[PDB]
Write an enzyme that holds these catalytic residues in place. Structure first.
Site, short mmCIF file in Angstrom:
data_model
loop_
_atom_site.label_atom_id
_atom_site.label_comp_id
_atom_site.label_asym_id
_atom_site.label_seq_id
_atom_site.Cartn_x
_atom_site.Cartn_y
_atom_site.Cartn_z
N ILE A 153 -10.56 21.53 -78.50
CA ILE A 153 -10.58 22.51 -79.90
C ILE A 153 -8.68 23.19 -79.92
O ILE A 153 -9.09 23.80 -78.80
CB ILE A 153 -11.33 23.14 -80.33
CG1 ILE A 153 -11.70 24.32 -81.52
CG2 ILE A 153 -12.04 23.80 -79.72
CD1 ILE A 153 -12.27 22.96 -82.53
N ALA A 154 -8.16 22.72 -80.82
CA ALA A 154 -7.55 23.79 -80.84
C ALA A 154 -6.64 24.25 -82.94
O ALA A 154 -7.21 22.93 -83.94
CB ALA A 154 -5.87 22.88 -80.46
N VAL A 155 -6.52 24.81 -82.85
CA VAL A 155 -6.42 25.83 -84.41
C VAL A 155 -4.48 26.31 -84.21
O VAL A 155 -4.50 26.79 -82.54
CB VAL A 155 -7.02 27.18 -84.31
CG1 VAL A 155 -6.57 27.54 -85.83
CG2 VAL A 155 -8.64 26.43 -84.55
N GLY A 177 -11.10 32.10 -89.13
CA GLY A 177 -12.67 31.32 -88.71
C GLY A 177 -12.34 30.26 -88.99
O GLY A 177 -14.22 29.94 -89.06
N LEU A 178 -11.93 29.09 -88.64
CA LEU A 178 -11.65 28.04 -88.61
C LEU A 178 -12.32 27.20 -87.84
O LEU A 178 -12.35 26.12 -87.77
CB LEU A 178 -9.94 27.62 -89.69
CG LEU A 178 -9.31 28.53 -90.87
CD1 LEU A 178 -8.21 28.08 -91.14
CD2 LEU A 178 -10.46 27.62 -91.75
N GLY A 179 -11.50 27.75 -86.66
CA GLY A 179 -11.98 27.10 -85.32
C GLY A 179 -13.39 26.91 -85.30
O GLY A 179 -14.60 26.11 -84.80
N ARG A 180 -14.52 28.05 -85.46
CA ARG A 180 -15.76 28.57 -85.82
C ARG A 180 -16.09 27.81 -86.87
O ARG A 180 -17.68 26.26 -86.65
CB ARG A 180 -16.24 29.77 -86.52
CG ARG A 180 -17.78 29.84 -86.04
CD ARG A 180 -18.10 31.63 -86.57
NE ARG A 180 -17.77 32.07 -85.63
CZ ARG A 180 -17.65 32.96 -85.02
NH1 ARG A 180 -15.87 34.18 -86.09
NH2 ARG A 180 -17.49 34.28 -84.04
N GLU A 240 -15.66 22.90 -71.14
CA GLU A 240 -15.38 22.83 -69.67
C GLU A 240 -13.81 24.14 -70.29
O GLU A 240 -13.10 23.40 -70.94
CB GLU A 240 -14.42 22.03 -69.06
CG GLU A 240 -14.00 22.08 -67.62
CD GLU A 240 -13.36 21.44 -67.42
OE1 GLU A 240 -14.67 20.16 -66.86
OE2 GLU A 240 -11.98 21.13 -66.92
N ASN A 273 -9.14 32.58 -70.33
CA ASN A 273 -9.17 31.68 -71.83
C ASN A 273 -9.58 32.46 -72.97
O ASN A 273 -11.51 32.16 -73.45
CB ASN A 273 -9.59 30.49 -72.70
CG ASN A 273 -8.80 29.96 -73.73
OD1 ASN A 273 -8.81 31.03 -74.60
ND2 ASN A 273 -8.08 28.56 -73.53
N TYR A 283 -17.39 30.72 -77.95
CA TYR A 283 -18.03 29.42 -77.67
C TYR A 283 -19.33 30.59 -77.48
O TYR A 283 -20.54 30.33 -78.29
CB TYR A 283 -18.07 28.88 -75.84
CG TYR A 283 -16.66 28.06 -76.35
CD1 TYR A 283 -15.99 27.48 -77.37
CD2 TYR A 283 -15.63 28.19 -75.32
CE1 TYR A 283 -14.64 26.50 -77.60
CE2 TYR A 283 -14.49 27.20 -75.41
CZ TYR A 283 -14.34 26.06 -75.90
OH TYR A 283 -13.22 25.74 -76.25
C1 LIG Z 1 -10.18 29.22 -79.42
C2 LIG Z 1 -9.25 29.15 -80.82
C3 LIG Z 1 -9.92 27.39 -80.92
C4 LIG Z 1 -9.88 29.81 -82.06
O1 LIG Z 1 -9.95 29.47 -83.42
P1 LIG Z 1 -9.69 30.23 -84.26
O2 LIG Z 1 -10.15 29.86 -85.61
O3 LIG Z 1 -8.47 31.14 -83.95
O4 LIG Z 1 -11.14 31.57 -84.01
P2 LIG Z 1 -12.19 32.16 -85.53
O5 LIG Z 1 -11.32 32.89 -86.41
O6 LIG Z 1 -12.91 30.92 -85.69
O7 LIG Z 1 -13.23 33.15 -84.54
C5 LIG Z 1 -13.72 32.26 -83.47
C6 LIG Z 1 -14.16 33.80 -82.01
O8 LIG Z 1 -13.56 34.17 -81.52
C7 LIG Z 1 -12.77 35.69 -81.34
N1 LIG Z 1 -11.27 35.09 -80.98
C8 LIG Z 1 -10.39 34.01 -81.77
N2 LIG Z 1 -9.41 34.19 -81.10
C9 LIG Z 1 -9.16 35.14 -80.60
C10 LIG Z 1 -8.64 35.88 -79.37
N3 LIG Z 1 -7.39 35.42 -79.39
N4 LIG Z 1 -8.93 37.05 -78.57
C11 LIG Z 1 -9.88 37.34 -78.87
N5 LIG Z 1 -10.69 36.93 -79.78
C12 LIG Z 1 -10.26 36.11 -80.05
C13 LIG Z 1 -12.56 35.80 -83.17
O9 LIG Z 1 -13.02 36.94 -83.31
C14 LIG Z 1 -14.71 34.79 -83.64
O10 LIG Z 1 -15.51 36.16 -82.91
P3 LIG Z 1 -15.86 37.10 -83.25
O11 LIG Z 1 -15.38 37.02 -85.46
O12 LIG Z 1 -17.83 36.60 -82.85
O13 LIG Z 1 -15.47 37.78 -82.83
C15 LIG Z 1 -7.72 29.48 -81.02
O14 LIG Z 1 -6.98 30.91 -80.47
C16 LIG Z 1 -6.80 28.41 -80.34
O15 LIG Z 1 -6.58 26.92 -81.16
N6 LIG Z 1 -6.88 28.28 -78.57
C17 LIG Z 1 -5.84 27.35 -78.73
C18 LIG Z 1 -6.39 25.75 -77.79
C19 LIG Z 1 -7.45 26.29 -77.12
O16 LIG Z 1 -7.23 26.88 -76.08
N7 LIG Z 1 -8.64 25.52 -77.11
C20 LIG Z 1 -9.83 25.98 -76.53
C21 LIG Z 1 -10.04 24.94 -74.55
S1 LIG Z 1 -9.41 23.35 -75.42
#
Ligand SMILES: CC(C)(COP(=O)(O)OP(=O)(O)OC[C@H]1O[C@@H](n2cnc3c(N)ncnc32)[C@H](O)[C@@H]1OP(=O)(O)O)[C@@H](O)C(=O)NCCC(=O)NCCS
EC number: 2.3.1.266
Length: 151
Positions: A69-71, A79-82, A103, A108, A115
């Site tokens: 998953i990547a945003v 909220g877009l990853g959720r 995994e 991270n 998750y």
């Molecule tokens: C992980 C990832 C997909 C999250 O997507 P996102 O759209 O930014 O996350 P959301 O806005 O939907 O919120 C998801 C939850 O994670 C928490 N969260 C998101 N980013 C965070 C950060 N940088 N630090 C701590 N918590 C974080 C959010 O607060 C939320 O939890 P909560 O609202 O109950 O507190 C994004 O950080 C990403 O693209 N990371 C790089 C790719 C990656 O490493 N993917 C996972 C392994 S493949």
């Protein structure tokens, strides 16, 4: 407006750019283009007229593995990853999938939190599993039970 759709072949260049940007450990090109095709339920989230996010998932029998998953960093903490994962989980339920596996590297925090909120449980910890420029890093294997609905 946010639209979730299938990640098709034409979407792949856009998604390949997001991969390099978003991931601390991006996939290689061969890995990225290989994780498509039969048994893959890959999705994009389009925020207005831009790809905001994608998810890579392989379905095998009544289980699935979220490979990616990547945003896009421009779109994070919004909220877009959720949202993408929720539509995925819904889609997996309609397909008879009872468990979504992933995994994730133990450091991270953002992924792990995402998750946790979706209900993923820690199945195991693979100690020193990922080789890195710094040495080794633990991997956490997580599983989400997906309860069956009436259709
Ligand atoms: C992980 C990832 C997909 C999250 O997507 P996102 O759209 O930014 O996350 P959301 O806005 O939907 O919120 C998801 C939850 O994670 C928490 N969260 C998101 N980013 C965070 C950060 N940088 N630090 C701590 N918590 C974080 C959010 O607060 C939320 O939890 P909560 O609202 O109950 O507190 C994004 O950080 C990403 O693209 N990371 C790089 C790719 C990656 O490493 N993917 C996972 C392994 S493949």
């Amino acid at each position: 407006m946010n639209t979730i759709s299938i990640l098709s072949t034409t979407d792949l260049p856009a998604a390949w750019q997001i991969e390099q940007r978003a991931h601390a450990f991006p996939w290689s090109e061969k890995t990225f283009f290989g994780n498509q095709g039969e048994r893959y339920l890959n999705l994009k989230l389009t925020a207005d007229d831009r790809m905001a996010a994608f998810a890579i998932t392989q379905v095998v029998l009544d289980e699935a593995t979220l490979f990616n998953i990547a945003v896009d960093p421009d779109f994070q903490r919004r909220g877009l990853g959720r949202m993408l994962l929720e539509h995925l989980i819904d889609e997996l339920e309609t397909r008879g999938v009872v468990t979504l596996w992933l995994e994730v590297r133990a450091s991270n925090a953002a992924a792990i939190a995402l998750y946790e909120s979706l209900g993923f449980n820690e199945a195991t910890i693979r100690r020193n599993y990922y080789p890195t420029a710094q040495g080794h890093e633990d991997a956490i294997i997580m599983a989400l039970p997906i309860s069956m609905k009436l259709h």
